[PDB]
Amino acid sequence: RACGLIIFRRCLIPKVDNNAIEFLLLQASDGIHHWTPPKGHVEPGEDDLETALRETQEEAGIEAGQLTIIEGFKRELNYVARNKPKTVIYWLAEVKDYDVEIRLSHEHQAYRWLGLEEACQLAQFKEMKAALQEGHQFLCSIEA
Secondary structure, three states: OEEEEEEEEEOOOOOOOOOOEEEEEEEEOOOOOOEEOOEEEOOOOOOHHHHHHHHHHHHHOOOHHHEEEEEEEEEEEEEEEOOEEEEEEEEEEEEOOOOOOOOOOOOEEEEEEEOHHHHHHHHOOHHHHHHHHHHHHHHHHHHO
16 A cells, blocks of 8 residues: 655746646666655554555655645555555645656656656556546636
């Protein structure tokens, strides 16, 4: 059982920015092929949202002060990785600063900020794509 945050940022501009919302994906170092938002495993004590935040600071270097959780959205992904069964829960979180410092751990070798389409294209796996898409869709509704 793992929890994480679909991190996104807002790009606010007069046609300069192709998109108003960009997602953070992190590249796995081991395997060299996996792109996900920050996530990780639940500790014995831990609340699920507690993991998502903690794991976001560990994986991406983003502290809670640099983050705001969008209430009302959550997505449980159920799938199969490395011949093993996986459960990941994600919430949507927004970064306060466009230029927030991303600090990777050994687990990841690069990050990218992406518009919804390219993000889905990079994530590749259907459940992750589905989740980012519904994440975005959620965000558009709240806006209106």
